[PDB]
Amino acid sequence: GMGSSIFDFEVLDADHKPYNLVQHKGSPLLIYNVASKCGYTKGGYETATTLYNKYKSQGFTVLAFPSNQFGGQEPGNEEEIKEFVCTKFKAEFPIMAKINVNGENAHPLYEYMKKTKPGILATKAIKWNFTSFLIDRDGVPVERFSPGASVKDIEEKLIPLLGSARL
Questions:
Q1: I want to staple 32 with a disulfide (CB 3.0 to 4.6 A). Which of 39, 53, 92, 130 is the partner?
Q2: Domains and CATH numbers, the chain
């Protein structure tokens, strides 16, 4: 069990100050590998913000980890954030340290997330916008919703977990 849950890894806050991710444990949460305000999101900001506020009643958090254009292979946004600069887009929900969500340069936590749950597409690589991972009350990725999933697309997988993912 080298990394049982997401919290086996440590997180950097928007300014790379130690983000206490594991205080979100006991509650289900989403985590977006997102282009931090560069070009466009396929409804990521809205969905993320909405989900946080709406499901915070059942104990839900949305963490958006920006994408570091300096990683080399940042999803499909590597061609985008060349004329833009991605840096914590900020919201009503916690936005994190931009990491290279892809490749070899990925944050070890995303190396965990990515390897754990391919999601709904081919393989388990990060090649697009915000793409949230459905993280349960324990910190296990149950799903990976790319920028193609809307609010309710996530809800169908989230609602049961918000209630109870394990116990």
A1: 130
A2: 1-167 (3.40.30.10)
